[PDB]
Amino acid sequence: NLPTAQEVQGLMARYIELVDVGDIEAIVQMFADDATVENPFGQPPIHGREQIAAFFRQGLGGVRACLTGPVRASHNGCGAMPFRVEMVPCALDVIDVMRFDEHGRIQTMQAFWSEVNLSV
Amino acid sequence: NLPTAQEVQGLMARYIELVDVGDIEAIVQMFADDATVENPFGQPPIHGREQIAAFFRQGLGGVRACLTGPVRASHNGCGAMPFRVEMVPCALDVIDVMRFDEHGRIQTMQAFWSEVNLSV
Numbered sequence: 139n140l141p142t143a144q145e146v147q148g149l150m151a152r153y154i155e156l157v158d159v160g161d162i163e164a165i166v167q168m169f170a171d172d173a174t175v176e177n178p179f180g181q182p183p184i185h186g187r188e189q190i191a192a193f194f195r196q197g198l199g200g201v202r203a204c205l206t207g208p209v210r211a212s213h214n215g216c217g218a219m220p221f222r223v224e225m226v227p228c229a230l231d232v233i234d235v236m237r238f239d240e241h242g243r244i245q246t247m248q249a250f251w252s253e254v255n256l257s258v
Numbered sequence: 259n260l261p262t263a264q265e266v267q268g269l270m271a272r273y274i275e276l277v278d279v280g281d282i283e284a285i286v287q288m289f290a291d292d293a294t295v296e297n298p299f300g301q302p303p304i305h306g307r308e309q310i311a312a313f314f315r316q317g318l319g320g321v322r323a324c325l326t327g328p329v330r331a332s333h334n335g336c337g338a339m340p341f342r343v344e345m346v347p348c349a350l351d352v353i354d355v356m357r358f359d360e361h362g363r364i365q366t367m368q369a370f371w372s373e374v375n376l377s378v
């Protein structure tokens with residue numbers, strides 16, 4: 139159903155674990171099939187599991203991700219977290235904001251970051 | 259005008275400095291006069307500088323606040339940051355998400371946190 143604050147902490151942490159390994163099918167299944175994803179925030183949103191799968195495929199395919207502090211969760215199915223992505227030879231500080239639906243799936247994801255958060 | 263990513267880092271950091279000391283008039287002046295503030299996210303929004311000033315007055319009046327990681331800024335006048343608030347004898351992990359207007363003032367502020375983020 140619509141995830142409690144504590145359940146939101148678990149789901150969002152699970153998302154980060156999945157990104158870290160790069161299990162694309164399992165990542166994609168975390169989203170609603172009509173999920174919208176803004177990454178970075180300000181860019182036009184990509185929509186739906188097909189467009190989202192492609193995003194993660196060229197994102198992660200050829201990469202590491204960890205939380206830098208606790209997940210902050212609300213009581214209306216949303217949450218936000220700080221993490222850092224590492225890659226190739228650099229690093230990127232990120233904050234994701236996620237809203238979950240009544241099935242425990244991600245309906246909306248906005249990622250906040252820009253080049254000032256980037257470090258080679 | 260509408261603040262660049264770097265300017266957003268400065269503004270949002272300045273907000274945190276102001277909260278730390280508790281300079282209420284200066285905090286309030288950071289907001290647009292018609293700013294909406296959701297704190298915590300999920301609660302109904304308070305609106306306008308009068309309702310916002312009252313919020314900070316009973317919040318900070320009788321308290322310390324610092325960033326726990328870098329501000330994450332976008333290119334469309336928004337940004338997000340992790341910080342921790344301390345008070346009385348406890349501590350609270352928080353993530354604020356802010357949108358700025360074309361005057362460098364805060365038009366919308368949503369704060370993400372709940373009791374799982376609280377620690378006595």
Ligand SMILES: C[C@]12CCc3c(ccc4cc(O)ccc34)[C@@H]1CCC2=O
Binds near residue numbers: 223232234
């Ligand atoms: C897309 C990305 C890979 C993964 C990733 C990036 C940026 C923000 C993200 C936010 C997420 O919630 C999950 C993954 C990313 C990367 C930026 C550069 C890059 O290759």
Ligand SMILES: C[C@]12CCc3c(ccc4cc(O)ccc34)[C@@H]1CCC2=O
Binds near residue numbers: 277317318350352354
């Ligand atoms: C309201 C509060 C004081 C300040 C503050 C709290 C919570 C979230 C905040 C978010 C902000 O961007 C600025 C200040 C607060 C506190 C929670 C409890 C409390 O007393």
